[PDB]
């Protein structure tokens, strides 16, 4: 029912051993060197 100006799909593949790192405030190899998320991030993460 809501409406936003733009949405961005950020598509990638990760290791299982890094999966919890797709979130604000995470660290590690991937979270620090591969995919960092903003602290004021607004959106939703999907994975399978």
């Amino acid at each position, epitope marked *: 029912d809501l409406c936003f100006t733009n949405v961005y799909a950020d598509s990638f593949v990760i290791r*299982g051993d890094e*999966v*919890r790192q797709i*979130a604000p405030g*995470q660290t*590690g190899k991937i979270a620090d060197y591969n995919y960092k998320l903003p602290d004021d991030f607004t959106g939703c993460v999907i994975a399978w």
Partner: antibody
Amino acid sequence: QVQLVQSGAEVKKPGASVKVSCKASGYTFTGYYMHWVRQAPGQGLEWMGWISPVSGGTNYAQKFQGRVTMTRDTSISTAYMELSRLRSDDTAVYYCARAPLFPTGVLAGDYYYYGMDVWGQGTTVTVS
Amino acid sequence: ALTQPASVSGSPGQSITISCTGTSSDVGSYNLVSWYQQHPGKAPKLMIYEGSKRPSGVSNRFSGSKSGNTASLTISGLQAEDEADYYCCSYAGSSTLVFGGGTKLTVL
């Protein structure tokens, strides 16, 4: 500056009961549900129950339902846990434990999250 | 209630992983898995909480991961001080959050 002190070592006979105290300071006492854990000498941990110092809410493990009883005194900020019908395998070290956050976590999860402050020691030995 | 290896060995500088397998009803439906470290004769210390969030003061070398029904502790840059027992924790349906065997970490 969170300080936690327990009672001393205790020895009991099989079939008797044991009463341990848990006196805290340096924080809001009723704002933290007090959890309890026991550990046999040389074995792993075993959680037993938790008490709410506010409104006196309590809930025990289904492993110990009917044998363990808690009360608390907010006037001196102390918890008290009693084990009844003691047997041989209850010789162990016992701690209380302070839960991590405040009970204002609308979606947080308290007081089921975890334990950041662990207490010193209470050893209960039950031998004939 | 959870199963984790009893003892795993590693080398200094290595990144080591510790597994802990549960079920779909306790670890597979809740993002509430943790890792505790305890030294011999010492008080346990919460290293990893709420999946991979860390209390203030814990080193960044300890991270967490969750896959299906499996929890994983990761340690980057293994050191001599890392020798201790590690327990995985997860809500199981009642009271409540107990550890496991006690993955004893040793350094070669």
